[PDB]
């Protein structure tokens, strides 16, 4: 049975603090990497180089999390209309509820509008989806984290 050093001498066999590092937020619908455009609008993209797909998440409480960019510092959010933008300040408008769906895909629900079930999906072409537009079940809302670079 092969194996190596490191994990053989390790004291933990999982990447420590791996939730602190940033990642990309794929989207089961298209092939895009959620993007919070410098200006502030959000959308899709396949450009594995897009300097605005490197998201840095965090949770001030269980389940609730902030989605953020490693380039600017835009606290992605959803407006009363169902529009995903990118607040500059952390505010109730930018708190999402994260959940690992049986299809092992995560889904974000605009905590604030939770009651209405508005997700952070992405319309096929790769454009942001209007809150109300989302439906629990469409690939649009099924995001799947990804490492910054390939391997």
């Amino acid at each position: 049975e092969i194996t190596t050093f490191t994990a053989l001498t390790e004291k933990f066999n999982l990447p420590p603090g791996n939730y602190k590092k940033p990642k990309l937020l794929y989207c089961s619908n298209g092939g895009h990497f959620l993007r919070i455009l410098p200006d502030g609008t959000v959308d899709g993209t396949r450009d594995r180089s897009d300097q605005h797909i490197q998201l840095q998440l965090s949770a001030e409480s269980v389940g609730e999390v902030y989605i953020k960019s490693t380039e600017t510092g835009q606290y992605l959010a959803m407006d009363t209309d169902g529009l995903l933008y990118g607040s500059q300040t952390p505010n109730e408008e930018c708190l999402f509820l994260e959940r690992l769906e049986e299809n092992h895909y995560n889904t974000y629900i605009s905590k604030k509008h939770a009651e209405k079930n508005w997700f952070v999906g992405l319309k096929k072409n790769g454009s942001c989806k209007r809150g109300p537009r989302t439906h629990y079940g469409q690939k649009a809302i099924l995001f799947l984290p990804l490492p910054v670079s390939s391997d």
Partner: protein, 213 residues
């Protein structure tokens, strides 16, 4: 001369997917005569069993169906349509993840019981793998007027300030006490919360004067 009967549906090569879930890579073509379909992994002949679970591609449907995928499969897959009059080819980059739908997993022994002199300043650590966004907290097993355990059967504690910042290890989760009077001698807990239930460890600290034996 071969051509993609379905071009429009062929700009999606990025296929990030969860483990053990069948994958189907295809790229329809045609021509005069029927062109061949060549495959390969990472960039070199993908055997019809080139890996565990083996494959089962329908060289007729211009597909490459793989089941129960594994991260070890993640590899830009390319199709090659070669014909006497032309040869076209497009590549799909596959990936495979293995989600950890659990609570935060915390390396053992951490935090670990330790000792210190009064006015000594200490730290306590915490490794935590945790796919799902964890929400790490540091408790202090305080004792409400009399007993350490309240009517909830669960211990009395208090969330702790945070004592400093990130600094040290961007991979660990330290809690830094400072003047540590013979008052921080209680028990400290690292409570790693998570969308999927809570996980947690604990440890003790003991502080003494300045001589000994």
């Amino acid at each position: 001369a071969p051509y993609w009967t379905r071009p429009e549906r062929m700009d999606k090569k990025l296929l990030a997917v969860p483990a053990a879930n069948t994958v189907r890579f295809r790229c329809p073509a045609a021509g005069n005569p029927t062109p061949s379909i060549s495959w390969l992994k990472n960039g070199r002949e993908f055997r019809g069993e080139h890996r565990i679970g083996g494959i089962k591609l329908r060289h007729q449907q211009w597909s490459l169906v793989m089941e129960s995928v594994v991260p070890s499969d993640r590899g830009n897959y390319t199709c090659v349509v070669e014909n006497k009059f032309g040869s076209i080819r497009q590549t799909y980059t596959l990936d495979v993840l293995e989600r950890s739908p659990h609570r935060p997993i915390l390396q053992a022994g951490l935090p670990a019981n330790q000792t210190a002199v009064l006015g000594s300043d200490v730290e306590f650590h915490c490794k935590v793998y945790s796919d799902a966004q964890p929400h790490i907290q540091w408790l202090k097993h305080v004792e409400v007027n009399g007993s350490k355990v309240g009517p909830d059967g669960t211990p009395y504690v208090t969330v702790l300030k945070t004592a400093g910042a990130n600094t040290t290890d961007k991979e660990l989760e330290v809690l830094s006490l400072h003047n540590v009077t013979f008052e921080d001698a209680g028990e400290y807990t690292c409570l790693a919360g998570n969308s999927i239930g809570f996980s947690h460890h604990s440890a003790w600290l003991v502080v003494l004067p300045a001589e000994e034996e």
